[PDB]
């Protein structure tokens with residue numbers, strides 16, 4: 001589990017969105033595994049606006065933050081899980097690292113801010129949904 005709290009937005013994995021998220025929906029995209037809902041309180045996270053390929057992510061199944069090298073956002077085939085059939089996921093970045101299903105939502109960050117959240121995993125890989133192209137997260 002986990003979310004990004006920027007401005008009056010909450011960014012979560014679409015497959016983990018709650019009823020309150022769907023009832024306060026701003027934007028969602030199944031191909032990216034992302035959903036954004038509106039919040040009453042202002043958040044403290046800032047979004048990175050860069051092309052970094054190194055950063056650090058939080059892994060809840062280890063209680064640890066790990067430094068990683070990750071690929072550029074791309075269209076990658078992801079195997080079937082309990083939330084999606086096997087399909088192509090867009091804007092996804094891969095790295096070598098531990099993940100389990102409940103690690104989804106952990107933040108990946110670089111020197112500029114939040115880069116994305118854990119969305120996929122297995123066999124020593126972790127995939128992150130990028131958010132750096134969503135410029136509207138920085139405005140009302």
Ligand SMILES: COc1ccccc1CC(=O)N1CC[C@@H](O)C1
Nearest residue numbers: 081083099100101119120121122
């Ligand atoms: C961190 O995720 C995992 C790690 C190990 C194994 C499996 C996963 C879950 C995973 O790949 N997905 C969840 C739904 C869809 O977004 C894809």
Ligand SMILES: [Zn+2]
Nearest residue numbers: 050052110112
């Ligand atoms: Zn950066």
